[PDB]
Design a protein around this ligand. Structure first.
Ligand SMILES: CC(=O)N(C)c1ccc(OCc2ccc(C(F)(F)F)cc2C(=O)OC(C)(C)C)cc1
Ligand SMILES: CC(=O)N(C)c1ccc(OCc2ccc(C(F)(F)F)cc2C(=O)OC(C)(C)C)cc1
Lengths: 15, 226, 228, 15
């Protein structure tokens, strides 16, 4: 997935 | 095309959503100017994400599709925001409300001439169009919601969402320029020029591998081909 | 947006302007060379038809020969891809070149192309087919693509842009007759030109990949697409 | 110039 190789971008979308 | 109430309230929500770094100073100072410039881009991604989360329909898409949209459009939003801060008189760009940055300042930050000259040509061509806060925020939204980005699952909904900001732009520009019907497609024709600029930026990221200048981890996950 | 008589006669002139190759054949050295030769000579035929179409466009020959070359160098592939999406058959997922032979994704692979170019050609062609453009909408979009002011080495940018906007205004006034209850149909056609630049850049990655595997382009295609 | 680098394209525009 793109989610597992974009961990910082996923973390900014959750915060 | 008349502006509806629900188009009006959406436009004003998008305007209201938009309303410490390394200091700018040898081989050591060459690295520090690159470090300052990349940390300005890190700040931008954080503001891109925060803006995108307030756009109607964005968080109802899958997080995978949200990542897919934001990975490829980030540079295009950054280039739209670069053109917003363009100064026609001093030939420069103002980042963080104080310091101006010309073409040689971009060169000292570690960018190639092949990237720098199409940034400043696009920014001068955008300055001639004289865009609003509302016209900028809508164009950013159209660029984020592109259905033809790599790895987009729900292509149909992303395209359906894009058309609602496209016709909100058309109804707004009919109020802003009521005697110029060409002003709405001129803004849309700048999104054509953004894709060439994004592709020119891909050659810049590829050139940083050839001179061993490493991206910071947030910028490297969105831009490097691993 | 009312269609003027000046726009009406211009549109119909562009429709009227749009009105022997080496043949496609076991897998061998002769087989993959001829399929590459068939595909590249279809491109040579197309360039000659693009040049001849561009000469008929009002304002084009009044621009300098340098600017004529500059516009035709970068837009050739974009016109070719638009003409590819016109000939797309949605039922068989294939494209009919030269009014007889249809070509799918594996036929494109057999002709020498990599898969990261092929699947973006076919996704675009499927997305263009949903819009259902006629001959006049296609000829106008080709003309907007040719007259792009932001192409490399264009001198008179202001005149190329002023010319572009007249076809854009003609497109707006045409689509108001063609789809009078859908106002989104005019900017949907313009949003496909955004997609066309990415595909032109994806084509640059294909041309670069041909140098690495030594499959050389014929003279006319080499001067427009290869970096010297 | 571009015209010196594009001799076949120039000749198609001339004819
Ligand atoms: C607009 C705004 O408010 N700010 C804070 C902002 C300033 C600079 C930014 O990016 C810096 C940058 C760093 C590295 C690379 C590299 F080298 F990786 F390609 C390219 C670029 C880059 O593409 O530059 C521009 C300026 C976007 C064209 C982004 C946003
Ligand atoms: C539309 C039409 O009626 N005709 C006759 C037509 C058919 C094929 C054409 O070009 C073949 C081609 C050959 C070589 C390369 C190489 F190898 F250089 F990349 C790329 C391509 C290429 O880009 O293919 C498409 C099909 C344009 C996407 C052009 C026009």
């Amino acid at each position: 997935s793109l989610t597992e190789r974009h961990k910082i971008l996923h973390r900014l979308l959750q915060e | 095309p008349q502006l509806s109430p629900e188009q009006l309230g959406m436009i004003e929500k998008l305007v209201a959503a938009q309303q410490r770094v390394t200091p700018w100073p040898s081989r050591e100072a060459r690295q520090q100017r690159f470090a300052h410039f990349t940390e300005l881009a890190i700040v931008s991604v954080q503001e891109i994400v925060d803006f995108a989360k307030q756009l109607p329909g964005f968080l109802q898409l899958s997080r995978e599709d949200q990542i897919a949209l934001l990975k490829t459009s980030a540079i295009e939003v950054m280039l739209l925001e670069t053109s917003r801060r363009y100064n026609p008189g001093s030939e420069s760009i103002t980042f963080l409300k104080d310091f101006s940055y010309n073409r040689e300042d971009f060169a000292k930050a570690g960018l190639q001439v092949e990237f720098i000259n199409p940034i400043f040509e696009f920014s001068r061509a955008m300055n001639e169009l004289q865009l609003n806060d509302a016209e900028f925020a809508l164009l950013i939204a159209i660029s984020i919601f592109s259905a033809d980005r790599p790895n987009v699952q729900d292509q149909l909904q992303v395209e359906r969402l894009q058309h609602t900001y496209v016709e909100a732009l058309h109804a707004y520009v009919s109020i802003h320029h009521p005697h110029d019907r060409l002003m709405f497609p001129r803004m849309l024709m700048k999104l054509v020029s953004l894709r060439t600029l994004s592709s020119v930026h891909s050659e810049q990221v590829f050139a940083l591998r050839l001179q061993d200048k490493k991206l910071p981890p947030l910028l490297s996950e969105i831009w490097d081909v691993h």
